[PDB]
Design a binder for this molecule. Structure first.
Ligand SMILES: OC[C@H]1O[C@@H](O[C@H]2[C@H](O)[C@@H](O)[C@H](O[C@H]3[C@H](O)[C@@H](O)[C@H](O[C@H]4[C@H](O)[C@@H](O)[C@H](O)O[C@@H]4CO)O[C@@H]3CO)O[C@@H]2CO)[C@H](O)[C@@H](O)[C@@H]1O
Ligand SMILES: OC[C@H]1O[C@@H](O[C@H]2[C@H](O)[C@@H](O)[C@H](O[C@H]3[C@H](O)[C@@H](O)[C@H](O[C@H]4[C@H](O)[C@@H](O)[C@H](O)O[C@@H]4CO)O[C@@H]3CO)O[C@@H]2CO)[C@H](O)[C@@H](O)[C@@H]1O
Ligand SMILES: [Zn+2]
Length: 472
């Protein structure tokens, strides 16, 4: 069957199904309703940065259309909606004055979701640092971010936490560290060779450390001030793509494990075990900041659940570990990614060049977290694939590849859960075609088509797939 035996009955009782967006990617009204600019507003408005010089000024205009979009998700039988609050929509300068119109938007959205029986899962941060904080403090390079983020988090807990019971602090700090500070292709565009300055061998580690410390401080505030009354939870969202040893050699198996440690262990070992992975300590040495015992104790156990964004997989080929002059976080891994084995590609690519369709990667990631980290509560916080630009409306709607993608990936997730993985929920990226960062509007991840000329929504085949699969 086109559902392939999948239904709510195929997953644990009370298992949560949702869709996901992020503020800058869908809201629009980027310079309206009192919102202050983020580092992404500045970046996207700079010619050459984004495909077609596009930006999120309007995006999908969810700001005005949110009731349409909530009605749609309810009609598709989803239980939950993961979205983010724009920090600069609440605090236009990142600190100080509150934008009451901004607060009103999120109240209206949260209240309508609950009215419609959709549980809000709320991210505090999704790449969108207030520009004022980047300029004044140097953003995530500054340890003061822990205080600044905590004050922002505190406001959100106070203001929305009587209704919001499922929080995330950050979205993919690895990608911020990697693209913002190693490669320098995302804001603030820092790297060794970059015009804005930087150092690809040191800054990604500083940035990751400050995300972990800020996460821990915000959760400490939640637990000490808000938890007793509000009785909600706070997690974090981490990207994890699977790495499989290219061969059964000791070298290749070590390479795959090294890649896992530099990718997900970078954050999970501090969050679960209170230290960075040993291999990163051994290889990165004095470039890897050290948690004090007090900080390690604040960070350890500070996530109530682990959000995982899972998309793809690759093979890893090893080498003899070498003494090398440090150049970048990326080069520190001492591995080679490989996308074919025995002459056959690991899988076909979606529109995004990095996204190989490899459903067994979902099983790989979830099983690995279960076995390595004491089976923590995991939520799949984003999974999906993209169509290219320039298709007709009807071609977008007949998204048979995406239907196959979800059926296969969810079957692999089911396999891991049936083997005992502690997965509490699953969220499809995305509800809507949206502003896909550097790809702008040239990458279409939605189960719902958005006509970017008219802003009309049209559910794709994959939307009706979810509706059928999720019927109560
Ligand atoms: O309906 C509005 C809109 O829907 C869009 O999506 C369509 C798909 O294009 C179409 O293929 C899909 O057909 C499903 C059907 O809904 C299921 O009920 C049926 O399930 C069968 C299954 O085939 C058997 O193997 C199994 O044993 O039994 C079940 C249940 O009896 O499977 C077919 C697919 O083969 O329906 C979607 C939703 O309508 C359309 O693209 C668009 O044109 C429509 O406007
Ligand atoms: O994109 C959809 C949606 O989900 C989330 O998107 C994240 C993904 O979770 C994350 O895996 C993805 O990471 C990519 C990254 O964007 C690429 O820049 C990077 O490219 C590699 C390249 O493949 C290599 O050949 C080269 O050597 O190195 C570069 C990196 O230096 O590959 C990784 C995947 O391995 O990034 C997405 C965001 O850009 C987000 O939460 C959401 O907002 C997205 O819309
Ligand atoms: Zn509008």
């Amino acid at each position: 069957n086109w559902l392939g035996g999948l239904s709510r009955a195929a997953f644990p009782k009370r298992f949560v199904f949702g869709t996901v967006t992020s503020a800058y990617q869908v809201e629009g009204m980027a310079a309206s309703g009192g919102r202050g600019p983020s580092i992404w507003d500045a970046f996207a408005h700079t010619p050459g940065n984004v495909a077609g010089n596009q930006n999120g000024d309007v995006a999908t205009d969810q700001y005005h259309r949110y009731k349409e979009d909530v009605n749609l998700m309810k009609s598709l039988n989803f239980d939950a909606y993961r979205f983010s609050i724009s920090w600069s929509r609440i605090f236009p300068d990142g600190e100080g004055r509150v934008n009451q119109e901004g607060v009103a938007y999120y109240n209206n959205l949260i209240n309508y979701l609950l009215q419609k029986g959709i549980t809000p899962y709320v991210n505090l941060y999704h790449y969108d640092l207030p520009l004022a904080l980047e300029k004044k403090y140097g953003g995530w390079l500054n340890a003061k971010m822990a205080d600044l983020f905590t004050e922002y988090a505190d406001f959100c807990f106070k203001t929305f936490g009587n209704r919001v019971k499922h929080w995330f602090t950050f979205n993919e700090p690895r990608i911020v560290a990697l693209l913002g500070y190693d490669q320098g292709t995302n804001p603030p565009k820092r790297c060794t060779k970059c015009a804005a300055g930087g150092n690809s061998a040191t800054e990604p580690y500083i940035v990751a450390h400050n995300f972990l410390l800020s996460h821990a401080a915000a959760v400490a505030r939640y637990r000490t001030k808000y938890q007793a009354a509000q009785q909600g939870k706070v997690g974090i969202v981490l990207d994890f793509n699977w790495y499989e040893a290219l061969s059964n050699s000791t070298e290749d198996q070590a390479a795959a494990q090294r890649a896992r440690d530099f990718h997900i262990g970078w954050y999970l070992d501090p969050l679960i075990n209170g230290h960075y992975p040993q291999i990163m300590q051994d290889l990165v040495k004095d470039r890897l900041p050290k948690f004090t015992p007090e900080q390690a104790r604040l960070v350890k156990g500070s996530a109530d659940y682990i959000g995982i964004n899972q998309y793809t997989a690759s093979y890893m080929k090893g080498q003899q570990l070498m003494q090398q002059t440090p150049t970048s976080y990326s080069a520190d891994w001492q591995v080679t990614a490989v996308f074919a084995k025995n002459g056959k590609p690991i899988g076909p690519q979606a529109n995004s060049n990095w996204l190989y369709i490899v459903p067994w990667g979902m099983y790989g990631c979830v099983n690995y977290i279960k076995q390595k980290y004491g089976n923590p509560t995991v939520v799949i916080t984003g999974n999906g694939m993209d169509q290219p630009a320039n298709l007709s409306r009807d071609q977008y709607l007949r998204d048979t590849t995406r239907v196959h993608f979800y059926r296969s990936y969810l079957t692999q997730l089911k396999k891991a859960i049936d083997e005992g993985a502690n997965v509490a929920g699953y969220f499809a990226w995305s509800l809507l075609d949206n502003f896909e960062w550097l790809s702008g509007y040239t990458s279409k991840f939605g189960i719902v088509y958005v006509d970017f000329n008219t802003l009309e929504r049209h559910p794709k085949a994959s939307a009706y797939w979810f509706r059928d699969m999720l019927k109560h």
